[PDB]
Amino acid sequence: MIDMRAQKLTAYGGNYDSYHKTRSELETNQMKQYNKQQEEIQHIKKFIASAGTYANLVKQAKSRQKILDKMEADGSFRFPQVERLPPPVLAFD
RNA sequence: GCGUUGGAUUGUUCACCCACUAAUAGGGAACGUGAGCUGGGUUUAGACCGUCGUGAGACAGGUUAGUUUUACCCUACUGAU
């Protein structure tokens, strides 16, 4: 089975159950990669913004910015619910 | 022209207080004066704490411990032939 969802034809052997399970696995893993990368970037940029005006602190944070830029160069629908209705609903006789 | 202080806390400059006093004026002289002193502070190397840092370490912050050499020359000055 071959899917088109990201301008790439992804070809995994099997059925929609196996393909959907495999795609859910890879989406979970790439969400975790994306999440760890943005947590690390958030920590680095937080220390960089924490450094105010000094010589030593801005040079340490400028070093961390070099590390960060080196890392950057290395890389539905809904149903509205029912009213409370008695159990007899319809009677065709 | 002559005089403008004694003390407490602080390394103090400044400071504010107690007390006397006629008065408790302000300053300069390489911010007088370290081959005149002292070396409390600052500001090498030891060490502690907080904060920041992944770390080595940083501190706009605190605390302690830390060697300060020579005149017999010319001159100036004071005295002496």
**Which bases of chain B come closer than 7 Å to a protein CB?**
52-56, 58-60
Q: How far apart are the first and last CA of chain A?
A: 48
- Does the CB of A45 fall within 7 Å of any strand B atom? no
Please report, rounded to whole angstroms, the spatial distance between the CA atom of protein residue A83 and the C1' atom of nucleotide B7. Answer: 93
Nearest nucleic acid nucleotide to A58, CA to C1' distance: B58
Determine the Cα–Cα distance for residues A23 and A16; give it in Å rounded to an integer.
10
Determination technique used: cryo-EM
Q: How far apart are CA A15 and CA A24, in angstroms?
A: 14
Q: How far apart are CA A79 and CA A82, in angstroms?
A: 9
With residue A19 as reference, give the H or E element that holds it: helix A16-50
For the CA atoms of A19, A25, A29, A34, the dihedral, rounded to the nearest 10 degrees, stands at 60
Residue A31 structure tokens: 């969400």
Structure resolution, Å:
3.6
Q: Quick one: A61 exposed, middle or buried, by C-beta within 10 A (0-12, 13-18, 19+)? A: buried
Q: Which two tokens stand for residue A10?
A: 């992804």
From residue A29, give the alpha-carbon distance in Å to each of A8, A22, A23, A40: 18, 11, 10, 17
CA at A50, C1' at B36: how many angstroms apart?
Answer: 53
A53 touches strand B (CB under 7 A): yes
